[PDB]
RNA sequence: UAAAUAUUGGCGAGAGACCGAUAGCGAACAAGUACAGUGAUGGAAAGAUGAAAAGAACUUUGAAAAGAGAGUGAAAAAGUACGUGAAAUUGUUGAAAGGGAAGGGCAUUUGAUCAGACAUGGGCCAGCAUCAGUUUUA
RNA sequence: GGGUGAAGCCAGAGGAAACUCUGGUGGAGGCUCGUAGCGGUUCUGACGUGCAAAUCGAUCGUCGAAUUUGGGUAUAGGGGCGAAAGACUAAUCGAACCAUCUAGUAGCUGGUUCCUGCCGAAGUUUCCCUCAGGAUAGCAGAAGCUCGUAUCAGUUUUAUG
RNA sequence: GAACCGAACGUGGAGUUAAGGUGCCGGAAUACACGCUCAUCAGACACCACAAAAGGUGUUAGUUCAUCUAGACAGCCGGACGGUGGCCAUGGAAGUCGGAAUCCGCUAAGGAGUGUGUAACAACUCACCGGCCGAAUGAACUAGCCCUGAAAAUGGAUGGCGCUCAAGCGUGUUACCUAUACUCCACCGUCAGGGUUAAUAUGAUGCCCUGACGAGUAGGCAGGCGUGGAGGUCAGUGACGAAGCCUAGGCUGUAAAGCUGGGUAGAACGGCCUCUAGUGCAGAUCUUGGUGGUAGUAGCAAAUAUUCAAAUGAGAACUUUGAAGACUGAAGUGGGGAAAGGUUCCACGUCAACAGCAGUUGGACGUGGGUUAGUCGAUCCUAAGAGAUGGGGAAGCUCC
RNA sequence: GGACAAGGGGAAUCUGACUGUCUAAUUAAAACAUAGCAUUGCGAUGGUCAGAAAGUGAUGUUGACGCAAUGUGAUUUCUGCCCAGUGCUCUGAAUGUCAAAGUGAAGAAAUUCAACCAAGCGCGGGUAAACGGCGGGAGUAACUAUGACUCUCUUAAGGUAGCCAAAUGCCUCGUCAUCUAAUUAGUGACGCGCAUGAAUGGAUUAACGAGAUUCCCACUGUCCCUAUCUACUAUCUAGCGAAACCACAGCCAAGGGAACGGGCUUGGCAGAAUCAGCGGGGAAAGAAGACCCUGUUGAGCUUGACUCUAGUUUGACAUU
RNA sequence: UGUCAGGUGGGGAGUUUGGCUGGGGCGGCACAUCUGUUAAACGAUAACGCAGAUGUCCUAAGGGGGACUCAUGGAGAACAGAAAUCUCCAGUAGAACAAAAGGGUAAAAGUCCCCUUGAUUUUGAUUUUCAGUGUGAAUACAAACCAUGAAAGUGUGGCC
RNA sequence: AAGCGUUCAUAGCGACAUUGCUUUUUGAUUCUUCGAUGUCGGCUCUUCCUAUCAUACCGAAGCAGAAUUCGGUAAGCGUUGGAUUGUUCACCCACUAAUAGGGAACGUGAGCUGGGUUUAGACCGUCGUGAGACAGGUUAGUUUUACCCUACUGAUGAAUGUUAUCGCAAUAGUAAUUGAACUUAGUACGAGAGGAACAGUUCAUUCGGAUAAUUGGUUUUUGCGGCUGUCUGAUCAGGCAUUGCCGCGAAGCUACCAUCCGCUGGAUUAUGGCUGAACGCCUCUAAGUCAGAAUCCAUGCUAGAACGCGAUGAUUUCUUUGCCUUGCACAAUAUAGAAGGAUAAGAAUAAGGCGUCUUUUUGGCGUCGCUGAACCAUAGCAGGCUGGCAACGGUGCUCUUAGCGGAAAGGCUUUGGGUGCUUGCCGGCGAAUUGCAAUGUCAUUUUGCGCAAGGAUAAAUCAUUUGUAUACGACUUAAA
């Protein structure tokens, strides 16, 4: 016999399956489509989440109710400390699609970058990249031959980037590798900035500019396990049910005489890898700077980090990036920020924005005072 | 009122084309016993070391049980968990195969293993030629 | 351990009288709220190869009498007892249990132990408190006896119904 | 695929066909010859797993009738009146609301008129005939293959892949594949018809010759294999090793089975002629006894609670002593009895089993010790009841 | 009442008055009991009841304000009509019927055919707080329903007071009114009511109910819509260590087939060993279907089924 | 009190409470028989197939012999009429024969008139259903004894 | 297709006849199951069908516009909240874009519920003399077991030299959904009444994936503060009341009860068109071709074949006893199957190749194909041992100079040197006996054995630790 009410399924389909995936980092599994006409440029970035905040901010939608008015929004706060470049691919066409033909590297790799070759890094004896930095004393004879050999073949040069986590307040060391795909014009103009770019330094500003889309890659949160009725979000059964109240109460029906893919079942939730796309970039400050939060309404010298500091993290005293809304992702992890795929027309991203006031309120709690300064002012000078 | 006639009980003697310890009486053994039921009643399992206990003195490892040696005897592959010690079922070693079961029948190949008249003085496996019987193809 | 406060007594107020009101005292009832005690409503909760062949929890009914219970004594199977449900009568009840007659009877179910060789069926006719069954003929095997090309044939032809 | 088509079967060898097939899976012509079909849902082989009425200028063949030396159809222009508004009908009917007449002229041809249109005319348009052009066209029907008609539930089935002058549909002509069928030979058994000890060794039940046949449940008869005992007989076998048991050793028989090498073991047991029976097992929710997978899994969670050192001991989460925390809270986890059990009370020794973990502890196990009454109970009296005697029943056990 | 302890309340309808009692382990009720009411039998040589029998018993250490046998079910209020049928009962009239023993006649006797005849049945009377029935079936008409006369069918009588789509109404979710935005429900009226109705008790009713049913107030995770916390499990380890079940085993689609394959046929396909969960399959386990039919198989209960019987009652003979 | 006889006696005892059947039960009879058909041109042949019958009536409606023609139509005769009785012509059965249906029959097997008891006795053989048993019915003789007719004959119940 | 529809058979309808399809109604039948397949509905959850109620894009009208009616390709996407009834069905009150119909053992009971039917208790009416009956009404009545195999949802993992980083993408899955307002405009259209649409702005509905700055919830933070009863002689400071109770309450977890985010290209269907035969015209079609819808396919997102691959990093002692690269012999082990040679134009097929001239091009003039029965290699003991004649070529083995080849390049030409053989043409010695045939053994893989040259001199697990993770593994960190 037939349903009766008819109404909508519990879950996306296309998500499938649900495990907790291999890589912590993101992992770009697609970039932008290239151009041989523009410039040569960095279509990603690495950075760590830091935490959340209030923002302030004007308003021009000439239609809406809300034009040109005060709008309390939500924000995240992204750690990103300049990129290093140690490396470049070459990737050539193939029926089969790409093949990766040969990797070089630079003269000096700091330890940072050479833990993540070891799990036993104080037991070992180091003796990562020792051989191939002999082949660098013959001025560049191994070297020019397969930078001539990628400058020849392939169609597509990405560039091998790590993280600097001395700088940032994590108890890591380690680095984190990760390529990045270079979308400029020609091949032979995209070897000759990578091979004068070995160990030089990247900043933030180079890639990322102010009042842009952003789309977001990280992991999810973590959970564990979990049931039927929290993690696809079926309906309890009644209160007076012998054995158990909080599943489905019919997996399927005999002929077909077995379990169907498409019924919600108990397993894994949390720690996929999601991909998120349009998030609109507000600031992109500097570490090189004391009153980064001071806007042109406000002008008080304070730092972006909260009194006491934000929870379970730290401080930031380097470049980071205010994203609107929220980031799929915990704190303490890595987070690849990409350029946008399709260029809007929308007129949400196309409005210019200017930041009236940024809370900095001791999130650990309740805080009422921003600064120390306005603290002793309210209150004071007793007993301490 | 004896005799010729009866007799799955009792006391005493003979026999068998009868059973051979899941048989034969319920009972070959401390069996109407152990045990169950308020009670009338119900009611099992359990035979075999060796000719002779000669039933393993003495050393050494272990807290001890036992173990390794030694010793008794024709034999301990007879040690009082005892003549012989099958199958289900298990451990070790050896040989072989294994992409949603294995296990069979016909025919080969390879690997293993095994019967069968060349011994006297010092049979098995094929090839060609001319014929017979049955066929096929120019 | 509380609540309610019936008869019976004592004192006052009103009234011309007949009598009528108010205050104490007293402690009635198959009354009432509730502990131990005795029961077993609902959760159709727990457990459901259990702690348990009927228990566990919370919620509930009744709680000074048609009450609850020990020891002794009476009633025994077509009998006993029953404020009556065919209830209870030693986990056994629309007729208990123990032995014997008893290896009760069954047109009904299930099983029925070694090889090759030769022949090879039937489910149809008549009768039956016959229709899941028997008798009777038909079909089958075995043993053969009297004879040795016979007066035969699931067939044809000529003549004729 | 129980039943359809072809064929009925002892064991093997060689040839040849039946029904059905020959792109590949699959052994065998990607043979030969003449047509038809192209499907945005093609079709594909009896019983058999479906399709109809009704339709198509999709294409192929055919039947009956017509016009043709300008076809005539085209297909673009020219005409479409004169008598005439014909009689009638009635507001008005003039070819065109209708009822009947249906005739002439000029004629190349023009109906007393095919419709449109108007109150009725007017105006347009056909029927019929020319003008341009130069060889086949027009109507009505019949059946072939294709298409529309043709909508069901998990993903799906000419057997599948795939096939388009086919590997499809209709028809013809040859080769080739192949059944336990047919022909011929070898061997087995059964049945029939003969011939022969006329001294002439060994079974007259013998020893030969010739011919046909062979499927089979229920059922019947025949000839053999094995098990336990009884009578006879091989002056059978055996402590120099009988019976039993084990064996990817061997030999014989179609088979039931039998004989024999190697190992183990330690007292009896075989063949041939006959007698006799508690004489052969895979099934019975069979009977008794033993052992598996499941599985080192289910589980050992209710009565609030344990901790630190010291001692004994081979060994201590659990025994004994200390210290600290706790609970029952006097309708009690307190102190005594009744029924019921019967040494469980108590000491010394001591852990193979039992105390669903452990154990030096124990209501366990081994060996002993322990209950003292004139006054506390029983004994004595009677209760609801039970029950002899004298008597009377009943064949009587016994009943009142 | 700072912990602990401790009633939710209101307006109705059906039903039994109340306290009480039962299906031990699925039914606690509207069932049973009850006070009250009524009926029947009995004066001891008696009623009711036991026993195989007795010089034997229970009621009864009794005597009608008692013992025995039934119905109804407190109070208020009423209990209408019908003795044809079926029971029960009688100082009813008899001779319609009617046993053995005895009486008579016939016969050689066995026998035979006659009258005579006890109770009990038939015939007559009584009885419904005995079992039961109290229906309708036809018609006549005043006026446009009129409820006064006739008969008579199943026998005798034809539903009186009362109450209702009621736990009793098939047609139905009756029609009208009310409660709601909306009501197959609830309550109030209507009644030719398939098939209501008077101690087989009718109508009403204060208190009481772990009884059934509808609505209103307060209250809330029942619900919109789920979220979080705590202990004890599960989970992992040390030790100890089972049962159910089991032909053989365990991947799908279609086909045909005992008409719904895990094994046959044609395709899809296919990679050691394993751990938490879970309830789609294994037509998953539980029990030789209890429903249904068959058997010439049974048992429990009932009665003008067939054949008997203890007890009791009438008559004859003996005791005499 | 004892023995025998008559009534009462579900208080108690024992036993039965058909079959077929598009499940059973309620209906119906297909359960002993008969006619036509289904039934497929010898016989045989099914269903709760179709249309219908029987559990009797008859001393004459049995048996024999002799007379004579019926249905219906047409033409004529007072009351008399579509229909009473009377007469002639045509008349192969279109009538009648105890009942269901089919077959059979014309100087008759129909209708009327004369005489009677073959609807009698003794026993076997034989067809049909069929086991080639019984039951029922039916057919053909032998030995008798009668009826009827001038006789030949016919008759052992109802024309089959 | 007789009539209806003012006129007019077919806009929409359609009598009298007649062919079908379907198994969501109910009968007919009794093949499967009676040593049991748990029988009514509701709750919960998944997927399939189209005979389409809505939404996308079109055709027809008795379509002026608005509303509605009939049909086409379409199952992509959605289809509700309540009163009464045990109900399926039914009937109402609203909302809505719309409140379409069905299947899956009449889906779904080791998933729940037990109101219904359906046992025993009991009551009422009709029927029966009576026990009892009633497809009449009424009330109270027991819902057992997964620890096994497959299935699904997550999680480890032996083995391809060992270990570690960074990637490609075969295949499988896939998602967005519908409305309201402002403007267009009170404009088109219409006598009026009424009353559109495309583009352009802002917001909502249902659904999905993350997230915790704020608001709300949770409180064993037993963090602070308050209050009862009792116990420690009093005060201070605490125990117990199975978390004693009460108020506020960080951290974490969480809510359309809180905030953010949810893409743009190509090829088609219906349908409407262009050029244009068949059929001298006409025609959307026969050949060819332009636009086109919630359809399909990519882009993008999810997993990553544990028997699909690639690139890069480091590769173990001196007890010697072992590692890698290249040549010796020795030795086992096998080979879906060597036995002269896998011998390189491209495009057309109602057309091409090769050679040679020239208004260098879709150009002239000749010639070949009709099968590879080809073309290159080919005579010597499985190919011996030595001579000359004639060329100055052909080849094998080594070594070097050059370059080309990334799709899986692991191979192709190429300068030169050195060193053999040479059947281009003549000479001189040798072979028997394997006894008349018996594949008569002449390949090519792996492999670890000892040699003797050249070369280099490590990691991962366990234990410990951490929380961005966590049933247990695993994952993420740290540590001379």
Request: hydrophobic share 35%; with cysteine.
């Given at each position: 016999?037939?349903?009766?009410?008819?109404?909508?399924?519990?879950?996306?389909?296309?998500?499938?399956?649900?495990?907790?995936?291999?890589?912590?980092?993101?992992?770009?599994?697609?970039?932008?489509?290239?151009?041989?006409?523009?410039?040569?440029?960095?279509?990603?970035?690495?950075?760590?989440?830091?935490?959340?905040?209030?923002?302030?901010?004007?308003?021009?939608?000439?239609?809406?109710?809300?034009?040109?008015?005060?709008?309390?929004?939500?924000?995240?706060?992204?750690?990103?400390?300049?990129?290093?470049?140690?490396?470049?691919?070459?990737?050539?066409?193939?029926?089969?699609?790409?093949?990766?033909?040969?990797?070089?590297?630079?003269?000096?790799?700091?330890?940072?970058?050479?833990?993540?070759?070891?799990?036993?890094?104080?037991?070992?004896?180091?003796?990562?990249?020792?051989?191939?930095?002999?082949?660098?004393?013959?001025?560049?004879?191994?070297?020019?031959?397969?930078?001539?050999?990628?400058?020849?073949?392939?169609?597509?040069?990405?560039?091998?980037?790590?993280?600097?986590?001395?700088?940032?307040?994590?108890?890591?060391?380690?680095?984190?590798?990760?390529?990045?795909?270079?979308?400029?014009?020609?091949?032979?103009?995209?070897?000759?900035?990578?091979?004068?770019?070995?160990?030089?330094?990247?900043?933030?500003?180079?890639?990322?500019?102010?009042?842009?889309?952003?789309?977001?890659?990280?992991?999810?949160?973590?959970?564990?396990?979990?049931?039927?009725?929290?993690?696809?979000?079926?309906?309890?059964?009644?209160?007076?049910?012998?054995?158990?109240?909080?599943?489905?109460?019919?997996?399927?029906?005999?002929?077909?005489?077995?379990?169907?893919?498409?019924?919600?079942?108990?397993?894994?939730?949390?720690?996929?890898?999601?991909?998120?796309?349009?998030?609109?970039?507000?600031?992109?400050?500097?570490?090189?700077?004391?009153?980064?939060?001071?806007?042109?309404?406000?002008?008080?010298?304070?730092?972006?980090?909260?009194?006491?500091?934000?929870?379970?993290?730290?401080?930031?005293?380097?470049?980071?990036?205010?994203?609107?809304?929220?980031?799929?992702?915990?704190?303490?992890?890595?987070?690849?920020?990409?350029?946008?795929?399709?260029?809007?027309?929308?007129?949400?991203?196309?409005?210019?924005?200017?930041?009236?006031?940024?809370?900095?309120?001791?999130?650990?709690?309740?805080?009422?005072?921003?600064?120390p300064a306005e603290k002793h002012a309210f209150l004071g000078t007793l007993k301490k």
């Open positions: 016999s037939h349903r009766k009410y008819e109404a909508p399924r519990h879950g996306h389909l296309g998500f499938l399956p649900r495990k907790r995936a291999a890589s912590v980092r993101g992992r770009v599994k697609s970039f932008p489509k290239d151009d041989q006409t523009k410039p040569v440029a960095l279509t990603s970035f690495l950075g760590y989440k830091a935490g959340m905040s209030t923002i302030v901010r004007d308003l021009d939608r000439p239609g809406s109710k809300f034009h040109k008015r005060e709008v309390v929004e939500a924000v995240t706060v992204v750690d990103t400390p300049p990129i290093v470049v140690v490396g470049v691919v070459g990737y050539v066409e193939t029926p089969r699609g790409l093949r990766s033909l040969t990797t070089v590297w630079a003269e000096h790799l700091s330890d940072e970058v050479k833990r993540r070759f070891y799990k036993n890094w104080y037991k070992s004896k180091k003796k990562a990249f020792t051989k191939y930095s002999a082949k660098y004393a013959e001025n560049g004879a191994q070297v020019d031959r397969e930078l001539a050999r990628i400058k020849k073949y392939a169609s597509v040069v990405r560039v091998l980037v790590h993280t600097q986590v001395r700088k940032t307040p994590l108890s890591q060391k380690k680095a984190h590798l990760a390529e990045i795909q270079l979308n400029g014009g020609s091949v032979s103009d995209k070897v000759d900035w990578a091979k004068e770019h070995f160990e030089k330094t990247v900043a933030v500003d180079s890639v990322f500019e102010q009042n842009e889309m952003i789309d977001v890659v990280a992991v999810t949160k973590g959970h564990g396990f979990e049931g039927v009725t929290h993690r696809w979000g079926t309906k309890k059964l009644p209160r007076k049910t012998h054995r158990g109240l909080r599943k489905v109460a019919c997996i399927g029906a005999w002929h077909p005489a077995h379990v169907m893919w498409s019924v919600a079942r108990a397993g894994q939730r949390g720690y996929h890898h999601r991909t998120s796309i349009n998030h609109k970039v507000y600031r992109v400050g500097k570490g090189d700077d004391e009153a980064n939060a001071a806007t042109e309404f406000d002008r008080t010298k304070k730092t972006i980090t909260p009194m006491g500091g934000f929870v379970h993290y730290g401080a930031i005293n380097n470049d980071f990036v205010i994203l609107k809304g929220s980031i799929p992702g915990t704190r303490k992890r890595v987070v690849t920020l990409r350029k946008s795929l399709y260029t809007n027309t929308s007129r949400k991203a196309l409005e210019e924005v200017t930041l009236k006031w940024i809370d900095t309120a001791s999130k650990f709690g309740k805080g009422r005072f921003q600064t």
